[PDB]
Design a protein around this ligand. Structure first.
Ligand SMILES: [Cu+2]
Ligand SMILES: [Cu+2]
Ligand SMILES: [Cu+2]
Ligand SMILES: [Cu+2]
Ligand SMILES: [Cu+2]
Ligand SMILES: [Cu+2]
Ligand SMILES: [Cu+2]
Ligand SMILES: [Cu+2]
Lengths: 439, 439
């Protein structure tokens, strides 16, 4: 096969992507060992769905797991009557998701389970895949002539040939694994054929962060979670929290081998110690550095010029309300809260008006990083930690370090009941989620 | 008695105003005829209550009417558990209102009935009185040395020695009377003893407007409904809609007689005509000019200088929500609506947070003027009809002409359930009222 493993692609045909996918325990070869994972479509990651605006998607999910499950179309601004976070598909049963891809949309999105209380073990076990919305912008020469790849960043731990079970500490921190994989492969080699690469990046891990840096190179950010930036942004490194996506251009500077690494990053995970009167919580500190892949540049690389512009960001109406959502923790109980409450599916927490804009101020009063996700309604991050964001683009996850306030501009789109929650999925399962009703 | 009739004053004593008032049908002499009115304290208007900030008011209202009644402490930012618009005092029963006068408060306020469906006939019949909150500002020489008077502007119509009954057309327009009175007197004479007058003005009419102008003189506005301006504002005339108050300084310029008039004003009241295929509604047009009082200046008047400053207006926090309230009419049905609905005491229309500020945009989509009143929470009028207000002061009624939008800054104070409504009281009785809950 190709030196660089990527999930198989399923494309819409004549404007329709019609597909049956099973969620099933699947024996496979992974990082060199045989293991049984939970997969969609018999692979890890699941197949990449590639569509265009205005396509119809008709996806029939057959539940072949011993527990109920469902799908969240992460990042898609569609109706919460389709992307229904409350729906349960019992074992053995099927459900068909049908929706039209919005006209003004582009980027890398993904699908995974969202049945409250069961997300973390199901996601950790291998249930996820990417969805790419192709754009007319992809035809500009600066992108068309680039070599494009998807990088699904997901870690795993195995025990007795199966995903390792969650411990109590995993429920508190969010579970990380020792196998730090790209597209389900252990440190693959990407032998580039072109001097410019276009990489779509997805953090599909439960809890692991990726402080991305390519040796000797900057990255040029061209898209965030839910759409293009207005113009490329040069960065030295790029942190992707759980649930986030980004697209970058890489302009290979000279021949050679360059490591793409996940540099050390401290997200505030905790351990326990006993020093003589102790048993108390103590910071785990920064993650150990990981090599994600080996990037081999071609002979005499001459990268394309960068695009001068990408997509203009919409001019939003003035907002009609300001919300404050405060995140807190009870680490030893592994309980997590928004405005002092845990999720209750029967309780509506916020009620807003469709087609108005709101300002959401999300404050992390905990000590751990928490990546805040809102379904259905992509947002523009104005500032985090009091620092203005250096670009305009649609996002649907925003990372908050301890103490930080994020200020978001949130246009409300589809009517109905949906959710917002931490995307360290253990924290969501353990209560850090609330309900928004849009009418 | 004094050439100029004013209601008797009841003052707090040692920080307490403790008073029993009866609401009772009362034979009296009015504008030269004997009539029976509905009064508080056996007089029309009722007694003026004069208090200071931090005083305790203990007012026991005995209902001696053949129908239920209650009190609204119009303009007082006190708790809606005291100023309770839903409370009913049955015939023969009593209720004690007890509250403390807020520390940061000054101006002319008033009391009258607010039992939904019965306000217009009860107010028209004579049930109202003023409440004055004295201020340390009253001690500055420019005010202390002025000659002070209260002018209660209220009209009346009599039929068979009693207030004229409401007709169907009265319910549509709001009832006006032919006797246009000041402090219950017909065109009294005010023989001034000082060159500067301080006049507290109250429009306690059901529906009549007073486009105020003093012959040959400007007026200097020093207070609006609920507090002082920041500095005096010179005006050529001053429109007071139902429920509004103002305080003005008058600087008498030369000896002589000067008429205070209510100049012609068209508030959009309607009549009916039949011209040959007709019976349809037709504008009544402007009111006929009325003389309110005769003002006699003293010998060689030398008015005091104006105060350079009054009270600085508070710096309000940034608002957290914007509301839109649209007023409409069904004239032939005499039904009146806010956002397409009529009042329902069981229905909460707006829910806000105490100690936050809201922006209320009130839009008149009717053809009549509607004076919009909010209980409990005084507001700052930012603009009306797209025109910025020329001063900062607390108001609690704002007049909207046909088509106009008022933009209000509304700090929410006391928690609880209260109301907002048109202060053409017939319109309130006929449905133009909604419910705000503050928590
Ligand atoms: Cu997700
Ligand atoms: Cu989501
Ligand atoms: Cu979290
Ligand atoms: Cu979610
Ligand atoms: Cu009133
Ligand atoms: Cu009121
Ligand atoms: Cu009205
Ligand atoms: Cu009222």
């Amino acid at each position: 096969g190709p030196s660089f493993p990527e999930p198989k692609v399923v494309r819409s045909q004549g404007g329709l992507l019609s597909l049956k996918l099973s969620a099933t325990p699947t024996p496979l070869a992974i990082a060199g060992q045989r293991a049984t994972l939970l997969t969609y479509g018999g692979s890890f990651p699941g197949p990449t769905l590639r569509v265009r605006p205005r396509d119809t998607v008709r996806l029939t999910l057959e539940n072949r797991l011993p527990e109920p499950t469902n799908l969240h179309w992460h990042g898609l601004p569609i109706s919460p009557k389709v992307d229904d976070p409350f729906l349960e598909i019992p074992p053995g049963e099927s459900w068909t998701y049908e929706f039209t891809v919005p006209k003004e949309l582009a980027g890398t999105f993904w699908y995974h389970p969202h049945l409250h209380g069961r997300v973390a073990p199901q996601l950790f076990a291998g249930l996820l895949g990417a969805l790419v919305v192709e754009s007319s912008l992809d035809a500009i020469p600066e992108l068309r002539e680039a070599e494009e790849h998807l990088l699904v960043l997901k870690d795993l731990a195995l025990q007795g040939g199966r995903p390792a079970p969650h411990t109590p500490m995993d429920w508190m921190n969010g579970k990380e694994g020792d196998l730090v994989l790209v597209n389900g492969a252990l440190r693959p080699t990407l032998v580039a054929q072109k001097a410019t690469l276009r990489l779509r990046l997805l953090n599909a891990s439960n809890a692991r962060y990726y402080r991305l840096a390519l040796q000797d190179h900057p990255l040029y950010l061209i898209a965030a979670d839910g759409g293009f930036l207005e113009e490329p942004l040069e960065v030295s490194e790029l942190l992707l929290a759980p649930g986030e996506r980004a697209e970058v251009l890489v302009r290979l500077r000279k021949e050679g081998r360059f490591l793409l690494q996940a540099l050390p990053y401290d997200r505030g995970a905790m351990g326990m110690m006993d020093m003589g009167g102790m048993a108390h919580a103590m910071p785990q500190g920064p993650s150990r550095p990981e090599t994600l892949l080996y990037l081999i540049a071609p002979k005499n690389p001459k990268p394309l010029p960068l695009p001068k512009a990408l997509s203009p960001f919409p001019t939003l109406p003035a907002p009609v309300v300001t919300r404050r959502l405060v995140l807190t923790e009870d680490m030893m109980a592994a309980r997590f809260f928004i405005n002092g409450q845990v999720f209750d599916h029967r309780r509506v927490d916020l009620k807003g008006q469709a087609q108005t804009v709101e300002v959401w101020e999300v404050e992390n009063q905990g000590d751990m990083d928490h990546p805040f996700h809102l379904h259905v309604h992509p947002f523009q991050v104005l500032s985090v930690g009091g620092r203005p964001f250096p670009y305009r683009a649609w996002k649907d996850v925003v990372n908050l370090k301890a103490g930080e306030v994020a200020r978001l501009l949130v246009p409300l789109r589809e009517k109905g009941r949906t959710v917002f929650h931490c995307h360290i999925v253990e924290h969501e399962d353990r209560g850090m989620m609330g309900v928004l009703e849009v009418g």
